Design a protein around this ligand. Sequence first.
Ligand SMILES: *[C@@H]1O[C@H](CO)[C@@H](O[C@@H]2O[C@H](CO)[C@@H](O)[C@H](O)[C@H]2NC(C)=O)[C@H](O)[C@H]1NC(C)=O
Ligand SMILES: [Cu+2]
Length: 223
Amino acid sequence: HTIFSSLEVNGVNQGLGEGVRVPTYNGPIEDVTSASIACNGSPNTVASTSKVITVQAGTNVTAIWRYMLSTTGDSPADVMDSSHKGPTIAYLKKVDNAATASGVGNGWFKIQQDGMDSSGVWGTERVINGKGRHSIKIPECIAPGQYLLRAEMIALHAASNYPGAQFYMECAQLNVVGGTGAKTPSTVSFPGAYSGSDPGVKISIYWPPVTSYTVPGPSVFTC
Ligand SMILES: *[C@@H]1O[C@H](CO)[C@@H](O[C@@H]2O[C@H](CO)[C@@H](O)[C@H](O)[C@H]2NC(C)=O)[C@H](O)[C@H]1NC(C)=O
Ligand SMILES: [Cu+2]
């Protein structure tokens, strides 16, 4: 249980729920076929926000994950339970109006992922033990304009069968300036990109112990 509840841009936190569509509750989505897998949703309640955050293409933004909306610390238990091992992932989607677009449907492309490294340490553990900071590079080569940023953590501790995997995601509202437009990504849909049979979704992480992990979704877009 965790919530991406604020974004840091050019080293400044943009505010709780400011430009990030936050749910009231910190529980996961489990149904990968639900429209809620795009930017969270039912049976949670997601707030709207009128703020659209300007970012420079080619810089990093940092998603800040916290246990609850009202959490004030940054220790491990203030981010997410240590049982919740899995990847961190981030996607962008070009939209005409980031304050109103729903996120559901086609247009997503993956820009960041951190699965399990050669030492057996998961992406979520780096966020839990790194003060909740999930750093994401906005590619320099995309078209300028309005985008949704979908940041995600997947917890796989209870994922031996499907349903089981726990998807935690929120969408931030961006205005990307300075992109060169040199490269057009191939895109996927949410729902659609993840399936309940994917090897990174239906997985027993302890028994037998996994040595490699395949992050779900498409390959990372690079310039
Ligand atoms: C910007 O975000 C990217 C991810 O989108 C970060 O790149 C990773 O950095 C770690 C080191 O901390 C490496 O182990 C990974 O190989 C990097 N991934 C990629 C795709 O390069 C990058 O560190 C971030 N930059 C800043 C300044 O925070
Ligand atoms: Cu949880």
